[PDB]
Design an enzyme around this catalytic site. Structure first.
Site, PDB file in Angstrom:
ATOM      1  CG  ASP A  20      -6.634  84.381 -65.751  1.00  0.00           C
ATOM      2  OD1 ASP A  20      -5.399  84.320 -65.639  1.00  0.00           O
ATOM      3  OD2 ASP A  20      -7.415  83.739 -65.019  1.00  0.00           O
ATOM      4  CD  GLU A  22      -8.186  80.443 -63.098  1.00  0.00           C
ATOM      5  OE1 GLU A  22      -8.081  81.658 -63.336  1.00  0.00           O
ATOM      6  OE2 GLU A  22      -7.310  79.790 -62.488  1.00  0.00           O
ATOM      7  CG  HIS A 178      -4.848  82.069 -57.463  1.00  0.00           C
ATOM      8  ND1 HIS A 178      -3.781  82.426 -58.261  1.00  0.00           N
ATOM      9  CD2 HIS A 178      -4.405  82.144 -56.186  1.00  0.00           C
ATOM     10  CE1 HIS A 178      -2.738  82.703 -57.498  1.00  0.00           C
ATOM     11  NE2 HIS A 178      -3.090  82.538 -56.235  1.00  0.00           N
ATOM     12  CG  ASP A 183      -6.289  85.985 -61.291  1.00  0.00           C
ATOM     13  OD1 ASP A 183      -6.297  86.729 -60.285  1.00  0.00           O
ATOM     14  OD2 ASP A 183      -5.913  84.795 -61.253  1.00  0.00           O
TER      15      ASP A 183
HETATM   16 MG   LIG Z   1      -6.148  83.026 -62.894  1.00  0.00          MG
HETATM   17 MG   LIG Z   2      -3.220  83.199 -65.216  1.00  0.00          MG
END
Ligand SMILES: [Mg+2]
Ligand SMILES: [Mg+2]
Ligand SMILES: [Co+2]
Ligand SMILES: [Co+2]
Ligand SMILES: [Mg+2]
Ligand SMILES: [Mg+2]
Lengths: 206, 207
Positions: A20, A22, A178, A183
């Protein structure tokens, strides 16, 4: 060695790694990578899938990086905070690749494949970060992915991560969402559940 | 109206459309789109999935497009061939969107989602052609897809189109492969099967 080989053999040589990311936007080539977490997997002797290793880095916005405030407002990241502990994109990926390349060594394994929710997004940012850093030894398949949004659509009739996790009988905390770490955790658990459930239902082996 | 809501209902509103493109390379931004086929789906009264409508267009290289001979060598397409019947990217997409938007009109549906093998490839070329043509009103979800390579990985342990189809019990003809129509067709049947197989083993409904 065995449990990493049984894993890969489940996916014809692919070594699935949950990722994941950001970011400071939706453009992988122009918006900053801000955070990355990676979770490797393993298969127990019974043939069940589960989370193995976890890495996580905050990433310094590369020079020239655009930053959309709507992005920062969304994930709450402050690229300026000193105690953040951000490293370069190079450092983050190099450390992750190093851990992944070792996985691929203990191999019926041939190449790594990214598992992510709407994987097209995370994949492109990773490929772009690696691009800027000029990393030659990239263990992830250059175009293929395991998108949990599509797998959840199939198994659960849901494509939203939270709703898919809830529908799967998983805990899900909107207050922790988030964030790269949470996540990735939920996504790896969701991925393992879908695969295992398919097994429990006799869909696998063939 | 019934078969489209049922279908859409299976995927929380998403109206799945199978897509396959042929191109002049791997760069969606700079390489030519050469071919596109689209297959809509439907759900019968028993809750099974199957192919519905099919359309197909050869596409003329947009002005400025690059063509990789390896790409052409791979798919066998000659962009200069006068009897291709190639249309503009605007025309192919407009015609496809028209048919898709007609489906979304069904009560249950609210957006289309692209089904494709290694869907990110096809999705990026589709989105770039739409961009070139300045097409508003694109019925396809802008970032979500149903990738059959991932679904076949789970369902069958295979990620390669031919391998997955064979492994699934379907006939696959390497002779006709790498053509838009045939590939979209095998891909649609493979998607329907994975969904149906899921249903037949009791994974769906959740009850
Ligand atoms: Mg995320
Ligand atoms: Mg994502
Ligand atoms: Co970077
Ligand atoms: Co075009
Ligand atoms: Mg294709
Ligand atoms: Mg094809």
């Amino acid at each position: 060695n065995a449990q990493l080989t049984g894993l890969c053999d489940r996916f014809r040589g692919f070594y699935p790694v949950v990722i994941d990311v950001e970011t400071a936007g939706f453009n992988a080539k122009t918006d900053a990578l801000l955070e990355i977490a990676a979770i490797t997997l393993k298969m127990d002797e019974q043939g069940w899938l589960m989370p193995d290793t976890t890495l996580h880095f905050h990433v310094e916005p590369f020079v020239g990086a655009n930053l959309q405030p709507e992005a920062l407002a969304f994930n709450g990241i402050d690229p300026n905070d000193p105690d953040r502990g951000a490293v370069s994109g190079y450092e983050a990926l190099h450390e992750i690749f190093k851990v992944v390349r070792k996985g691929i060594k203990a191999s019926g394994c041939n190449r790594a494949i990214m598992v992510a929710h709407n994987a097209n997004f995370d994949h492109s940012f990773m490929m772009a970060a690696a691009e800027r850093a000029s990393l030659k030894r990239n263990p992830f398949h250059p175009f293929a992915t395991f998108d949990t949004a599509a797998l959840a659509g199939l198994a659960l009739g849901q494509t939203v991560l939270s709703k898919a996790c809830q529908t799967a009988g998983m805990d899900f905390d909107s207050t922790q969402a988030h964030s790269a770490l949470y996540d990735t955790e939920r996504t790896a658990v969701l991925f393992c559940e879908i695969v295992n459930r398919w097994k429990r239902l006799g869909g696998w082996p063939l």
